[PDB]
Structures are given as structure tokens and as C-alpha cells.
Amino acid sequence: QGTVNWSVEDIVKGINSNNLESQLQATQAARKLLSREKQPPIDNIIRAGLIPKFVSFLGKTDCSPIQFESAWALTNIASGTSEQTKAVVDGGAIPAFISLLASPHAHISEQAVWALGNIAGDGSAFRDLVIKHGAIDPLLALLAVPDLSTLACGYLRNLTWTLSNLCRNKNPAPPLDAVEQILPTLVRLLHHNDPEVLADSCWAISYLTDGPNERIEMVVKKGVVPQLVKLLGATELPIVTPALRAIGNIVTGTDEQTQKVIDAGALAVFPSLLTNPKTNIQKEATWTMSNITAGRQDQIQQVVNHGLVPFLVGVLSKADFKTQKEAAWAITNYTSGGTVEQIVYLVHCGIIEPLMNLLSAKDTKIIQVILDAISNIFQAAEKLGETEKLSIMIEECGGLDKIEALQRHENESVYKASLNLIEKYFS
Amino acid sequence: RKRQKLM
């Protein structure tokens, strides 16, 4: 292979030669230049004006090697900044790649899938432009096989990643018709036995579930929540992270969607998620819990039945401070929407000491959340003639001191609520 | 977002 380490000048000489095979050699040399991880000369290749020549090569049926080489080079040009991807798009590459998707050579169609994914990954605009050119139909036609296992592993992984990029990005979100067109194949991929396919499919579902309740409902109608929970229980963290993200997105919708999550058995997995060694898994699991303790009282009772209140107490006691803030949110929602029996159970699980210990943080929001939770618990106690007991409890663990110190805190509502508590339950 | 193809 004497196509190693050409100069941009030599490649330009070869591509302008009007000799199909000299052009093929120059295009392979360009591909190898662009395939180096140490600063590929993308900008230099663009300034040479080579993108139109590559795009024209994309359509040379009688020379599949130059098709593959130009597709690879343009894929690696589109893998760069938004301006480089834009240079690829302006050359007319989208329709050429969509036409290549029907190539009878598997590696060329795979490279076209790769390039289209790189393009759509730039953002909403290029995503929707790829959709408008009619990519979804051929992309999904490539997956129209009885058993996904017959497809090549890398082929299927690239197809899944591209389809996931077609579901990515918001403001705007993907077209509803496109999501309806993709979701069946996406579910079939979500039921695949390959870990990377599963991770990309869960990321796609997490993208689709990040939005209004209508999108969440589109996703939930397809009965993917049970599979999402099964994957939530997986050992491969790359699969668990997107599955937890998707469950947390779904529980932000209506209480019926949250209830479908609960029915699928998600809570049973949360004892592990809330003690996960990954800080972000813990944080997102606590964030998901906060969106469940905000729901109905029967759902709070489901949380309690699964014995997850001790795990929230633990997270509040020792965890990354952001996880602790999400836990404070969950506790405040619990107390605001829960019964008196449930608030009493929360206090019995040992919430008061770790809740007080967080009133010395420098985050003003967590102070407000904790004070709101304390006010709710004190209301629940008033409903029992137990305010004296709870005040004694908060005093014996050093909480009264922090509450008093919060009267000089700069923020307004902070000292307002703290002074209210001081004057109302401590006299 | 994007993925470069390496040799």
C-alpha cells in the first residue's frame, strides 16, 4: 500500500487527474490521512476543495472502491466541528449517501449509514434535513429481516447508532411521524442480545422520552417499559445508564405512566441503583425517586412497601452532594404529597439527623427544600399533637442550632421560613 | 454526537 502519507498537494494532483484510478488512489490516501487520530487534516482537505469531488465519487456505480473510500473520507470530515459537517452537507452529500444506502455492497451501505449518523448528530437542523431527504425508509429497510442476528455485528451497531442520532436533540424534537416510523424497529433492537445495540437503543428511547407527556406516551404505548426495567437490572453499566435515564424521563410524565413503570417492577431494582458505585447512577436513581414520591399516595406507599425509604435515608446520610440534593427533593415531595402515617414512617426510618446535617451546606436551594420538608413533617405532627416530640428530636441532634443560624442567611425566603419555624415550634 | 472511523 503506497497510499500512506501523501501531501494534500499530491492528493489534489491525483483527484484532478481525470483518471478514475489515479483518483481512487488519491481518495484512498485522503481517507488514510483523515483516519489518523492525531489531528486529521480536515480543514486542509476542505480548503483544497475536495468535498465536491468526493460527493461526485459517491455516485460512481461502476467503481465501488472509490465509493467506499470517498464515503469513509466524508464520514471523517463530517465527524468534526459543525462547520466541517456543514461543509460536507453543502457539497450535496446527504442525497448521495441516501442513494448509497441501497448499495449491494454491505460495507458501502454501512459507511453511508455512518456518514448519515455523523451528519444527523450535528444537531436538530441537519437531523431533520436528513429525515426530509428520505433516509428513514431505506435505513429501516436495511433492518427488515426476520432475525436481527443474521446481520453483521458492526453493521447492526452502526445502524442502531445512526437511528439513535435521528431520535436525538430537542428544540426542535424529531418529527412525530418520524418517531412513529422508527419506534417499532427501535423496540425490536431494544430486544436484541448485543450490549452495544442495547445501549444505543436505550439512549434513543431516552431521547424520545425527554419531552412532553405526548412523547412519553408514544413510547410507553409500545410496551417497552418492562424491557427498560429488565435492562435497568443489567450488569453492563453502559446499558444501565441509558435505561435509568429513560425510566427517569418516563416518571416525569403523568401518574399513569409512573404507575406503568412501577407495575413493571422498577422499584425492585432501586436498592442496587441507590447504592451503585457510580455517582451518576446514584444521582439519577435518586432523581427518579423524587419524581415518584411526587406522585399519588398509593405510589408513595409502593415506594415504602419496597423498603426504599431506608435507602433514601442512606443517600441523604452519605453520598455525592448532588445525589443528596436530589434526595432532599424526593423527601420534600414525599412529605408534601404523603399521608400522616407515611410521614411518621419516614421520621421513624431516621430522616431527621441526615436532614439536619444538610442545613450547613452552601447551596441556598437545598436549604429551602429541607425547610419545606421540615414544615410538612411538622404539619403532620401537629395533626397528632406531637410537635413537642419532633421539636425535642430536632433539638437533640443539633438541628435547632442550624435553624436559628439560618435566620441571618442572606436569602429572603430562607430566613423567612427559618424564623417562622423558630417562632412556631420553639418557644 | 459524532464518531470518526479509524484504520
Residue numbers in the entry:
A (entry chain E): 71 to 497
B (entry chain B): 361 to 367
Give verbatim excerpts from the published study on this entry.
The MERS-CoV ORF4b protein is a viral accessory protein that functions as an innate immune inhibitor and strongly localizes to the nucleus, despite virus replication occurring exclusively within the cytoplasmic compartment. The MERS-CoV ORF4b protein has been shown to bind preferentially to the nuclear import adapter IMPα3 in infected cells, thereby inhibiting NF-κB-dependent innate immune responses. Here we provide a detailed, structural basis for the interaction between MERS-CoV ORF4b and its innate immune suppression target, the nuclear import adapter IMPα. Our results provide a detailed structural basis that explains how a virus can target the IMPα nuclear import adapter to impair immunity, and illustrate how small mutations in ORF4b, like those found in closely related coronaviruses such as HKU5, change the IMPα binding mechanism.
Since structural data of the binding site of NF-κB on IMPα remains elusive, we tested whether these sites overlapped. We crystallized the well-characterized NLS of p5026 in complex with both IMPα2 and IMPα3, and found that it bound at the major site of both IMPα2 and IMPα3 through highly similar interactions involving p50 residues 361RKRQKM in which Lys362 bound at the P2 site. Overall, there was clear overlap in the binding sites of MERS-CoV ORF4b and NF-κB on both IMPα2 and IMPα3. Our crystal structures confirm that the binding site for the NLS region of p50 is located within the major site of IMPα, overlapping directly with the high-affinity P0 Arg binding site of ORF4b. Structural analysis of the NF-κB component p50 bound to IMPα2 and IMPα3 demonstrates that there is a direct overlap between the binding sites for this host transcription factor component and its competitive ORF4b inhibitor.
